[PDB]
Structure 1
Amino acid sequence: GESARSLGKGSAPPGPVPEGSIRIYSMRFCPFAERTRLVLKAKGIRHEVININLKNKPEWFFKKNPFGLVPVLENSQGQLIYESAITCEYLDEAYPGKKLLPDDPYEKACQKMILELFSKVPSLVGSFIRSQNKEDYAGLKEEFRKEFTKLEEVLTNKKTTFFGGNSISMIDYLIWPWFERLEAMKLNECVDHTPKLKLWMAAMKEDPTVSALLTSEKDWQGFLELYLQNSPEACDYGL
């Protein structure tokens, strides 16, 4: 547990990544980094995790990523990869086993076009956590419903349980983290008019990879309380 404690301002710069492993600079409750971690687990990629204290960042972390954001991958050759969707594509291409993206160019384009249908949602979740009263919350639920309707149409047309087909694939892992957070944000009723999307969330929670990385609502709550109190201890909630 204590192994997972974040590195913050003053921490020593970490040593090289061992041959045979890849390193992720992550934060345990960051949904962007959770994308990368789902791919690492889904493909069985040996890796180590460094958690960054995103309230109290080490100055050395800007040498990993000039933007100072997670996720970041670093390999034994010293190559650095950042931006969540880019880290996922890299892992899918660089490592053996189950291809999470289709080989077919059109079917891969389709997965990126769905990602684009989804692209407003992270900004709404970012706005949501700030909402202050029942009126802002009503408005926020209607904004989620309009984005969710777009995703419902994809499942309607394909009649597959997942966005890439009847098997879970990269697009499902790239959107999952924000759906994971919906219960805890009390935004669960925004899937009520999207029945295929509501079944999709149940299917996802049964996925071995999703289940293995799922955080309890309790744990996500304890985090958000500290993040919103502006606490340097938020990222190390529970230890």
Structure 2
Amino acid sequence: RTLGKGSQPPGPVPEGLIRIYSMRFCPYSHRTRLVLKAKDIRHEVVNINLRNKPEWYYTKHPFGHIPVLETSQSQLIYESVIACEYLDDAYPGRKLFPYDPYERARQKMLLELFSKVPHLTKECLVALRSGRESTNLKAALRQEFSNLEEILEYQNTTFFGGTSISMIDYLLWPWFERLDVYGILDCVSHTPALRLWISAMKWDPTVSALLMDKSIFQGFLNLYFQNNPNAFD
């Protein structure tokens, strides 16, 4: 249940735990939650009301952004990519980034290639939900997906880092999970390797464990676009 304006600050993070400040429908926070689960890290999730934030939350992030990690030593780490990096380095078990410094750099280069997708998927949703023109936004998204399709086809591997899932896949996933409910699943109709990747991801135990309830997510979006503040509670 989300904490907002009026909520008491949480206590210190206990030794042996790490805390993530999140919101159940935030795709950036979804990234970091995937990495936490995939590495079997003991953690607690504190959800934040993004419309009416707790004033104390600005002591966690100066602009009240999520996700933020808080450690038992009162250290704050943000935002999603830096947090995922930290978790992979700080918790030795099941390394998600590659062993090879070049391959790690390549994954970060792939992440840069992906940089327009979050904005484009969001703008697609807003356009479709507001009845505004979406042809250009979908065309732009299809082009970014073609760039990713070319990588998978060239490599001839199911995932972006090889035959097994790795950090880069989890970093991209949240926006692909959302294509269906956003009404833009048709934007991968020209990219068969990407469609295989989507399925491969759904079969991943960590992805499967964190899959959103589609009906609840639709309910959230409906109240969000009604400007109803209760959408964030």
How does the TM-score come out when normalised to structure 1? 0.94
The residue type paired with residue 213 of structure 1 is L
Q: Find the residue that maps to 2:134 and give its secondary structure.
A: helix
Contact 1:11 1:58 in 2 (8 A): yes
Distance 1:9 1:135, change over 3 A: closer
Partner of residue 33 from structure 1, selected from 11, 29, 32: 29
Q: Which residue matches 1:78? A: 74
Q: Find the residue that maps to 1:116 and give its secondary structure.
A: helix
Q: Relative to structure 2, which stretch is displaced further, 84-93 or 96-105?
A: 96-105
Alignment of 1:147-166 (within 5 A): 147-166=144-163
Q: Which structure 2 segments of 5+ residues have no match?
A: none
Q: Which residue matches 2:110? A: 114
Matches of 2:72 and 2:227 in 1, distance apart?
A: 35
Matches of 1:229 and 1:134 in 2, distance apart?
A: 14
Matches of 1:108 and 1:31 in 2, distance apart?
A: 22
Matches of 2:32 and 2:177 in 1, distance apart?
A: 15
The residue type paired with residue 178 of structure 2 is R
Matches of 1:20 and 1:230 in 2, distance apart?
A: 40
Matches of 1:29 and 1:205 in 2, distance apart?
A: 17
Q: Which structure 1 segments of 5+ residues have no match?
A: none
Partner of residue 87 from structure 2, selected from 85, 91, 113: 91
Q: Percent same amino acid at aligned positions?
A: 66
The residue type paired with residue 170 of structure 2 is Y
How does the TM-score come out when normalised to structure 2? 0.96
Matches of 1:26 and 1:232 in 2, distance apart?
A: 18
Contact 1:53 1:232 in 2 (8 A): no
Structure 1 outlier segments of 4+, above 3 Å: 132-135
1:43-85 deviation per Cα after TM superposition (whole angstroms, max 9, x unaligned)? 0000011100001100100000112111000010000001100
Contact 1:28 1:235 in 2 (8 A): no
1:185-205 deviation per Cα after TM superposition (whole angstroms, max 9, x unaligned)? 111111111100010001000
Q: Which residue matches 2:178? A: 181
Contact 2:127 2:133 in 1 (8 A): yes
Matches of 1:203 and 1:95 in 2, distance apart?
A: 25
Q: CA deviation at 1:135?
A: 6.9
Alignment of 1:188-203 (within 5 A): 188-203=185-200
Q: Which residue matches 2:231? A: 234
Q: Which residue matches 1:24? A: 20
1:193-218 deviation per Cα after TM superposition (whole angstroms, max 9, x unaligned)? 11000100010000000000001221
Q: Which residue matches 2:10? A: 14
Q: CA deviation at 1:23?
A: 0.3
1:103-126 deviation per Cα after TM superposition (whole angstroms, max 9, x unaligned)? 211100110111011100011122
Q: CA deviation at 1:219?
A: 1.8
Q: Find the residue that maps to 2:120 and give its secondary structure.
A: helix
Matches of 1:135 and 1:234 in 2, distance apart?
A: 22
Q: Find the residue that maps to 1:48 and give its secondary structure.
A: strand
Q: Relative to structure 2, which stretch is displaced further, 184-193 or 29-38?
A: 184-193
Matches of 2:28 and 2:22 in 1, distance apart?
A: 9
